[PDB]
Amino acid sequence: KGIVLEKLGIESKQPNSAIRKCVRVQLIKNGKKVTAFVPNDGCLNFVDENDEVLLAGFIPGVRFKVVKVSGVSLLALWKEKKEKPR
Amino acid sequence: YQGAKLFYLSGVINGRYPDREILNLSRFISVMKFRPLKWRNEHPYMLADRFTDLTHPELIETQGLQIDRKVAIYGYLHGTPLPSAPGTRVHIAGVGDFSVAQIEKLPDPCPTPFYQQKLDDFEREKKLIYAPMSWNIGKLIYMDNISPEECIRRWRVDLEKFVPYFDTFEKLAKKWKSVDAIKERFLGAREMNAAKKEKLRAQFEIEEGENFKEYDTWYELQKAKISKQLEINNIEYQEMTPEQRQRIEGFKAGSYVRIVFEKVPMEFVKNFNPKFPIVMGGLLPTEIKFGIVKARLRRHRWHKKILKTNDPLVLSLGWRRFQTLPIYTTTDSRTRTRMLKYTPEHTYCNAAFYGPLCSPNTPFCGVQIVANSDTGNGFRIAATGIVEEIDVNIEIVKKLKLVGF
Amino acid sequence: ERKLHVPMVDRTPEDDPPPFIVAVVGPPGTGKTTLIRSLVRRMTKSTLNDIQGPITVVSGKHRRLTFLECPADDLNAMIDIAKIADLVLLLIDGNFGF
Amino acid sequence: QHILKNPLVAQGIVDKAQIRPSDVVLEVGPGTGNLTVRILEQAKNVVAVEMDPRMAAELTKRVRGTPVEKKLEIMLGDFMKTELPYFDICISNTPYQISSPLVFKLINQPRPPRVSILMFQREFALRLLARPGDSLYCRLSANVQMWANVTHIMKVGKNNFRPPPQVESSVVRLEIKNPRPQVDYNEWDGLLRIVFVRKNRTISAGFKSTTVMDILEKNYKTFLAMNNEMVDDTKGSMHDVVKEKIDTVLKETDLGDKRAGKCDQNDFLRLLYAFHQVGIHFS
Amino acid sequence: GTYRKRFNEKARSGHMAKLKELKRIRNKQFTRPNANAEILEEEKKMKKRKLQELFTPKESKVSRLKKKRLDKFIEHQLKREERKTIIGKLQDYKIDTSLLTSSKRLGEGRQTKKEEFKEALSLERQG
Amino acid sequence: KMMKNKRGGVIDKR
Amino acid sequence: KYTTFQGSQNFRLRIVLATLSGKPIKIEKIRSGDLNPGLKDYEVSFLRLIESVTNGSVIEISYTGTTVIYRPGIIVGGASTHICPSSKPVGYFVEPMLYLAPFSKKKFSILFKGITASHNDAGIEAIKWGLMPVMEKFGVRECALHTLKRGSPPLGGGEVHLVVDSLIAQPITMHEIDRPIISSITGVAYSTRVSPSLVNRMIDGAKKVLKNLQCEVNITADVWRGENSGKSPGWGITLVAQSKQKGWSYFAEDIGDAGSIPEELGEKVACQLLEEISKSAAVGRNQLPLAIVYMVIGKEDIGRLRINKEQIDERFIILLRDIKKIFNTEVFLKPVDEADNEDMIATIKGIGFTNTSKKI
RNA sequence: UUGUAAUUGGAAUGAGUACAAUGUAAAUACCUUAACGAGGAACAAUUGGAGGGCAAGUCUGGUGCCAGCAGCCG
Ligand SMILES: Nc1nc2c(ncn2[C@@H]2O[C@H](COP(=O)(O)OP(=O)(O)OP(=O)(O)O)[C@@H](O)[C@H]2O)c(=O)[nH]1
Ligand SMILES: [Mg+2]
């Protein structure tokens, strides 16, 4: 589990760049800050600040990807089969 | 959520359901716990238990029914404590925004048995249904009648002068010929050996104590700080006298209160249906301000049609609901804010509209039709989004192409 | 891991908390009124023939509940009860469906 | 000659110097100026000592037409031969050939710097940082710890320098003690030199040397002369007196059987005071 | 598993007591009422002492470091005081060093005439 | 450029 | 409609508090009976500065100049340059910006120009070492005041750059119920267009007063000469007593006039520092208004600060009354349990303020 | 003689609905079975991976008309 601190590539000009898909996340177990991938910018819209994100093993150096946000699958949101509860 | 409890009711006998599963439902509600929600824990809100108009009927006849009324609403407070002083800005859903003319607490009309037992126990030391519709210095500062100079002399010039008042140089010099009386503040720098040990222990604590001064997880560490601060709040309030306590914290949640509002529309009093709830919600300073709201908005998945720029659309921000004309935009690879004609079919887009401002991260939904006549059969939730920014101006721009041959 | 979540501050007072708001929401004719009457009888042993607006009742030694029947035909209500409802009882007609 | 090329270590050096905006910096071995431009950025003014006129000319060219041009001053000469201006902080990546003398000069400046960041060879830095009882504890350690306190900032690698040298490097911080302890430099150095010929032998063995006895006897005779008491001045007149003085002081101080390498500041200070009591002055 | 940490040691105090006894017998090498009765201060002291000795939290990491640092600091302060006293008594006994021969000469062991003239001139100046 | 993103302003009737 | 105030009293505070609260205010009868009625030039310049760092704010100054209508907008900040009239030094305008800087949509980057010191307003060193640390205690991690050029009165010519990188939602809750143990005394003795001797005599002057003390005394000598030294000769000192334990600072400062003795000023400022520490419990008198205001705009929790019975003077009372008028918050004071001193604990409930201007 | 059909013909059939019977302590279900139950047989099979192409569209770089990124936005 982790906390979304800031979306680093949100200002990037090139759409769907690798930078655009990187999000800084604070690991809640130890408080260590790490970076994670989101499948795509369309999925990046769902992720906003201060939400629960479940991370899984995967721009070298980024080794995590988001699989659930706020307790809901990112894929489920991206296929539009669920709505993120706030 | 997957695995959610779902109760099953078979039939109705004597206008009542079978007792067996009603017990199951009742027990489930009894043992239930509630998560802390962001909006609920940052605003004070109240559901009106009863509604009463205090307007003198003499005024109603002389000026006529059209005169604005004064109304009293009673109910249990929720969320953050409501400030005791009058003048607080609140919004009633479907009515508008008003100012608290008066506020006072009343005895609880439906005391819980545990509460009544304590009061009865207090009496020694010296109903289940409620359905009405169905010279201390501190005082001296806050008595404005006494001038501050008069205050000071009793219990013993301006901030433009940053340097604080000092006595004359010579008398100050005579006062500080010796460094005594302040030695305690400064660090010091066969039986006496133990005496030496104690001072050095105190110095060591003073020099490095903090670096030394554990919970397993970072989460528990965050919770501990919150709990510790909450504990401090309780201790200060428990030392605190009940009347002065109400003056500082205000009216805490669970207090049954009377709120009186002036200048309410008369239609609210005349067109009152007890079925429709009356919801009062406090407003933060930003909620009062009006301006341009920048938000990320997307067409709802189950809405049949895409939305259009400059199309009326009813928003639900915070306590308030209102109709505006939003403009849907695109970042153009984060270069310029280009106006769109319609919302993306299956993706978010930046939406700009004018209305009451709200703090960022305030979610909202959108609806195009609220009247029953035009409901039809389609889904009425049209758009969903999150407010991204608040501003008084914005620079949307459209592509204009000049043609020649 | 599933234990850990974002820290937030719970502002519920430590003593004499307010009754929880229970919103009975459903399409017209599902049985919102009868459900409220059934529960009210169980916790209080008395039957309310007619119910309007909030009704506060004792449910335990130190627990209270306020029941509000949302107008099924009004969307505007559904928005603001949803804003203040601590618990929502979604009445669903099994025969008809969602 | 060797030149650093890692920017991060230079940034760390300038940062941990903690240059206040009203400080003047004595920056030895300016090099290409990588350190100098940053130090000019956050300093009142910088005084630089360059051995190579060409290299200082390159520095002037680099800083010319810049806002920090007026702040910089360059001195051309030998760091030791030059007489230096007042300075608050000393930051150097000078060749280690002048490493040991440099420190003492900073210690013996009329107004010593409050803080200096110095780069040295690893072994030399450890010997500076060595504590009593350590293997590398030596005369340098005791002397500098009398006149200052030395701490370790970084270990700087071989690869950072080009062409790579044959030894590692390190960066340390020196803080000269204000007020200076009121002990003669000469007496302290003399005692330590007599005691540190073989630091892992007994101090009595150190004093057993014939040359040490001769020097101590001559110094005792000189001290008697200064006190106006007459003295014979023959070679072996006071040998039997100085030897028994030494034995008595060594026995009473209980330092006779303690190795020099395992003796701290206070043990040496006690020995010095006792020797002054009995009348022997070392240097 | 015998002495493993338990979720609530207070709930099973008596159990833990047995363990201590077992330890006291197992590690001794290294160290070297009728309830069924018709009718039923020192016992309160027994309760207090047994429960206190049974439960004493093991001192923590930060407590360890605090103890070591307190010891080092306080010894350092004592050393500073002793140094100050010795240095004062040194200022009591002080002279110049120009005439005294430095210990730097310890290695030489033999001398030229030039210094001998210098020494001869020096001792003449002294008288 | 000062006036591009302004909505208030000083109204001095002195 | 408008909260009404009387006179020029607490003009900067009332404006600043209006900004933080977002409540419109009215100030009337400003120097009505004076021969030259209405606002002074520097007060108008201060309003201009407020307009520059805000957006949506509307300000009216009356035809006679004796009445002000102020409607706050949002704090937006940005990069700007402000020319400070000679009537006041730079510290006059910098001080209110410290209140508003952490709570902006963009970082504050303001270049102030004018006289850099005076007898009545916060100096450069007062801000750098005396107030900004209190902000750092409140959560403002990054804040800097760079002195590009010193300008002494009367011709001034000094330039300073204020940069506040830290943008925070609201100040942290204070819990300081003890008397900080101050570990060392530091200070800065500065001079312009004059010989270095004055600074040394000054540091010598302060040292005599403080020599009897049991802590270190090290005063920096910052002599300014040349192009960056301003247009006028001047010299002043700021002495700061620092408590490394909890990062608290107590400071006193003043500047010298032509013909005054450098030693005497050093002695006077040293004595004034001994006064402030005698009167202070957790913060100095000159730092208290900043401390109180930030607590009021903290989260909705009870913050505790220890204050001495000396700090409760006229200025303290009016500050609380103005706060109550705008924010409706009441500061509660309780006695400490100790008998050695007669300090009191000021307990303030925050209003739950949050910096909504910043983008997320 | 290959590929494609919201083309077209009448035959078969169970998911489901349901008389009855069987089953069962009583029931549900299974096996049976009158009678209904198919052309988009809308009685609307999924989960992953790979590769295109399109503009008066957008961004970036430059030995012209190009290349990269990418393109739910013209
Ligand atoms: N057979 C049967 N009838 C039910 C059931 N639940 C409700 N009903 C009937 O549905 C009708 C409506 O009951 P209400 O309690 O008024 O439902 P409601 O939610 O109040 O409906 P409205 O207030 O009109 O919007 C009553 O005649 C009930 O007998 C059920 O499970 N079975
Ligand atoms: Mg009903």
Annotated binding site of D: 2, 4, 29, 50, 78, 93
Q: Is strand H less than 7 A from the beta carbon of A75?
A: yes
Q: Which long-range contacts (CB under 8 A, 24 or more apart) does C4-8 make?
A: C4/A1, C4/A28, C4/A29, C4/B217, C4/B219, C5/A1, C5/A28, C5/A52, C5/B219, C6/A3, C6/A28, C6/A50, C6/A51, C6/A52, C7/B219, C7/B222, C7/B223, C7/B226, C8/B36, C8/B38, C8/B41
Q: Do the strands G68-71 and G58-61 form a parallel or antiparallel pair, or are they unpaired? A: antiparallel
Q: Is strand H less than 7 A from the beta carbon of B335?
A: yes
If we measure between CA atoms, which residue out of G295, G301, G305 comes closest to residue G344?
A: G305
Name every residue whose Cβ is closer than 8 Å to that of residue D144 and which is 6 or more positions away in sequence.
D103, D107, D128, D150, D174
- CA–CA dist G287, G272 (Å, integer): 15
**Touching, B vs E (3+ Cβ pairs under 8 A):** yes
The CA dihedral of B189, B190, B195, B198, to the nearest 10 degrees, is 90
Domain boundary pick from G274, G307, G338: G274
Q: Which two tokens stand for residue E76?
A: 């350092």
**Touching, D vs E (3+ Cβ pairs under 8 A):** yes
Q: Which of C33, C78, C95 to mutate to test the pocket of ligand 1 (most atoms within 8 A of CB)?
A: C33
Q: Do G147 and D20 touch (CB under 8 A)?
A: no
Mutate to test the interface with D, among G188, G216, G219, G222 (most CBs of D within 10 A): G222
- Same domain for G154 and G10? yes
- Same domain for G239 and G350? no
Measure CA G212 to chain center: 30
- CA–CA dist B273, B67 (Å, integer): 20
Which ligand is nearest to the Cα of residue C93, counting in written order? Answer: 1
Fill in the DSSP letter of residue D184. -
Is the CB of residue C34 below 6 angstroms from any atom belonging to ligand 1? yes
Residue type, D241: V
Q: Which long-range contacts (CB under 8 A, 24 or more apart) does D67-70 make?
A: D68/D37, D68/D40, D68/D41, D70/G227
C-alpha distance from E74 to closest chain B C-alpha (Å): 6
If we measure between CA atoms, which residue out of B327, B37, C43, B142 comes closest to residue G324?
A: B142
Residue type, B9: L
**Ligand 2 center–CA B402 separation, angstroms:** 63
| 3-class state of residue A5 by DSSP | strand
Fill in the DSSP letter of residue B160. T
Q: At what angle do helices D7-17 and D34-41 cross, to 10 degrees?
A: 40
CATH number of domain containing G229: 3.30.360.20
Q: Do the strands B96-105 and B256-264 form a parallel or antiparallel pair, or are they unpaired? A: antiparallel
- Same domain for G257 and G133? no
E strands, chain G, in order: 3-6, 25-28, 54-55, 58-61, 68-71, 74-75, 78-83, 108-114, 144-149, 158-164, 175-176, 184-192, 217-224, 234-243, 248-255, 302-307, 332-335, 344-349
Buried b (16+ CB within 10 A) or exposed e, D164-193: eeeeebbbbbbebeeeeeebbbbbbbbbbb
Residue type, B391: D
Neighboring chain D residues of E102 at a CB cutoff of 8 Å: 186, 190, 283
Q: Is residue G55 part of a domain?
A: yes
- Same domain for G182 and G252? yes
Residues 46-85 of C with CB under 8 A from B: 46-48, 50-66, 68-71, 73-77, 79-81, 83-84
| 3-class state of residue C69 by DSSP | strand
* Structure determined by: cryo-EM
Q: Is residue G204 part of a domain?
A: yes
Q: Which two tokens stand for residue E10?
A: 């207070």
- CA–CA dist G174, C23 (Å, integer): 40
Intra-chain end-to-end CA distance of chain C, in Å = 35
- Same domain for G243 and G336? no
Is the CB of residue C28 below 6 angstroms from any atom belonging to ligand 1? yes
Q: How crowded is the C-beta side of D161, counted as CA atoms within 13 Å?
A: 20
- CA–CA dist G161, G156 (Å, integer): 16
Instruction: Find the domain containing G219 and state its range.
Output: 178-274
β-partners of residue G81 are G111
- Same domain for G231 and G284? no
- Same domain for G248 and G301? no
Query: With left for phi above 0 and alpha for psi between -120 and 50, is residue D26 left, alpha or beta?
Result: beta
- CA–CA dist B42, G170 (Å, integer): 14
- Same domain for G84 and G122? yes
Positive or negative CA dihedral for B167, B168, B169, B174?
A: negative
- CA–CA dist G226, G343 (Å, integer): 48
**Closest residue CA from atom 19 of ligand 1:** C32
How many CB atoms sit inside 10 A of residue B318's CB?
22
E37 touches chain D (CB under 8 A): no
Name every residue whose Cβ is closer than 8 Å to that of residue B342 and which is 6 or more positions away in sequence.
B306, B307, B308, B309, B328
Domain boundary pick from G274, G296, G319: G274
Name every residue whose Cβ is closer than 8 Å to that of residue B20 and which is 6 or more positions away in sequence.
none
Name every residue whose Cβ is closer than 8 Å to that of residue D37 and which is 6 or more positions away in sequence.
D62, D63, D68
If we measure between CA atoms, which residue out of G169, G163, G99 comes closest to residue G139?
A: G169
β-partners of residue B397 are B338
β-partners of residue D26 are D47, D90
CATH number of domain containing G9: 3.65.10.20
Nearest nucleotide to B401 (CA to C1') is H56
Which ligand is nearest to the Cα of residue C52, counting in written order? Answer: 2
Percentage helix, strand, coil, to 5, in chain A? 15, 35, 50
Which ligand is nearest to the Cα of residue C26, counting in written order? Answer: 1
Show me where chain A is broken: residue before each gap, C-N > 2.5 A. 58
- Chain H nucleotides covered by protein, CB below 7 Å: 47-48, 56, 58-60, 68-74
- Same domain for G38 and G154? yes
Buried b (16+ CB within 10 A) or exposed e, B341-362: eebeeeebbbbbbebbbbbbeb
How buried is B371 (Cβ within 10 angstroms: 0-12 exposed, 13-18 middle, 19+ buried)?
exposed
Q: Do G188 and D21 touch (CB under 8 A)?
A: no
What separation in angstroms does the CA of A85 have from each of A5, A41, A51, B363, C22? Answer: 19, 20, 10, 11, 20
Contact D255, D191 (CB under 8 A): no
Q: At what angle do helices G288-296 and G11-21 cross, to 10 degrees?
A: 20
Nearest CB neighbour to A86, from listed B219, B346, B363 = B363
- CA–CA dist B257, B85 (Å, integer): 13
How many CB atoms sit inside 10 A of residue G50's CB?
25
- CA–CA dist G114, G160 (Å, integer): 9
Domain boundary pick from G248, G274, G300: G274
C-alpha distance from F6 to closest chain G C-alpha (Å): 6
Q: Is strand H less than 7 A from the beta carbon of B344?
A: yes
Contact B45, B78 (CB under 8 A): yes
Q: How crowded is the C-beta side of G153, counted as CA atoms within 13 Å?
A: 17
Measure CA B278 to chain center: 17
Q: Do the strands G217-224 and G184-192 form a parallel or antiparallel pair, or are they unpaired? A: parallel
What separation in angstroms does the CA of A50 have from each of A5, B36, C83? Answer: 7, 15, 21
Name every residue whose Cβ is closer than 8 Å to that of residue A74 and which is 6 or more positions away in sequence.
A38, A39, A43, A46, A47, A66, A67, A68
Report resolution in angstroms.
3.9
Q: Is residue G127 part of a domain?
A: yes
**Touching, A vs E (3+ Cβ pairs under 8 A):** no
**Closest residue CA from atom 25 of ligand 1:** C28
Q: Is residue G339 part of a domain?
A: yes
**Ligand 1 center–CA B16 separation, angstroms:** 10
| Strands, sheet with G158-164, edge to edge from the N-terminal-most edge strand | G78-83, G108-114, G158-164, G144-149
- Same domain for G6 and G111? yes
Q: Is residue G259 part of a domain?
A: yes
- CA–CA dist C8, G238 (Å, integer): 44
Q: Do B141 and G9 touch (CB under 8 A)?
A: no
C-alpha distance from C72 to closest chain A C-alpha (Å): 23
Percentage helix, strand, coil, to 5, in chain D? 45, 20, 40
- Same domain for G265 and G282? no
Please state the domain count of chain G.
2
- Same domain for G81 and G144? yes
Q: Is residue G360 part of a domain?
A: no
Q: Which long-range contacts (CB under 8 A, 24 or more apart) does B189-197 make?
A: B189/G214, B189/G215, B197/E74
If we measure between CA atoms, which residue out of B117, B105, B71, B59 comes closest to residue B280?
A: B71
If we measure between CA atoms, which residue out of D134, B131, E109 comes closest to residue C68?
A: B131
Measure CA A30 to chain center: 19
